[PDB]
């Protein structure tokens, strides 16, 4: 599900560092970084630091940051630190509309979320939980906190019996529109993804309609419902959530800033390919084309290259 195309043969890290050093003092930045594995990128920064006694990304942390710079930053950081950074920004100016915390918590494996929590300790001298719990409110806080603290079991075991009872419970609640119900939050934040999927399968069978369809009758301005919706999507079929967010970003309709750069950089090495396929089906136009639709500067260039479509 990865789009990133890594050179089956890459030069020595020191040579990449030298070139990158020259490029930083632009198609050379794309040619290199967008075609290196996370491991190789790690080595490159490391070699760069040894040679110049300065981190390659030092000039990009700045928030008076250019889109292209921003993309380089997110992409060249280690996944854990990147997620810690994204989570931190989400908490700094949180609003009922921000769902990035949920995103990082539900589209990551338990291990990746742990790395994010550890990188968070190192970079911010605090735990992700305390900040989320500190700056979020009401029901939003109850779900977001439960989600970021989880360290889910990832095996395939499924307890069909439990799946049916909890499917029952979730229905009795969504029914009277108690989206913020205690058990609903518990199930989505504690059960494994396999068990949750089985729970919603039983939900659909035992009651006829699909879970998301069920929630479509609710108010569209209910920010919590919107959050619960995305939560269910990200735990079930993430691509569905990512495609919708990509849609609003490109159509400059969203209130989710940096969404485009975040999605491409955070998923390129994971499931961007499947996200792309879905984007194409849902819009008829390939994602790389939608990105280079009006402009094609270094920024758009970097993104399409991460999508494996350099000349798009």
Task: Outline the fold blueprint.
Blueprint: H1 13-24, H2 27-33, H3 38-52, H4 67-76, H5 79-92, H6 100-106, H7 110-124, H8 128-135, H9 138-149, H10 160-175, H11 182-190, H12 193-207, H13 211-215, H14 223-236, H15 238-250, H16 259-267, H17 272-283, H18 287-291, H19 298-306
Helix pairs in contact: 1-2, 1-3, 4-16, 4-19, 5-7, 5-8, 6-9, 8-9, 9-11, 10-12, 14-15, 15-17
Please characterize this protein's 3D structure:
- This protein has about 300 residues and is an all-alpha fold.
- About 65% of the residues lie in helices and about 0% in strands.
- α5 runs parallel beside α8 (about 130-135) and α8 packs antiparallel against α9 (about 140-150).
- The longest helix has 16 residues, at about 160-175.
* The top level CATH class name of the largest domain: Mainly Alpha
Shape: globular
CATH architecture annotation name of the largest domain: Orthogonal Bundle
Strand content: under 5%
Q: CATH fold name of the largest domain, please?
A: Annexin V, domain 1
Largest sheet: none
Strand-and-helix sequence, N→C?
Answer: HHHHHHHHHHHHHHHHHHH
Total beta strand runs: 0
Structural class: mainly alpha
Total of DSSP H or I helical runs spanning 4+ residues: 19
Distance between the termini: 19 Å
Question: How many domains in all?
Answer: 4
- Approximate helicity band: 55-70%
CATH homologous superfamily descriptor of the largest domain = Annexin
| Rg value | 21 Å
PDB class: metal binding protein
Keywords: structural genomics, protein structure initiative, Center for Eukaryotic Structural GENOMICS, AT1G35720, annexin, membrane-binding, calcium-binding, metal binding protein
Assembly: monomeric
Entry title: X-RAY structure of annexin from arabidopsis thaliana gene AT1G35720
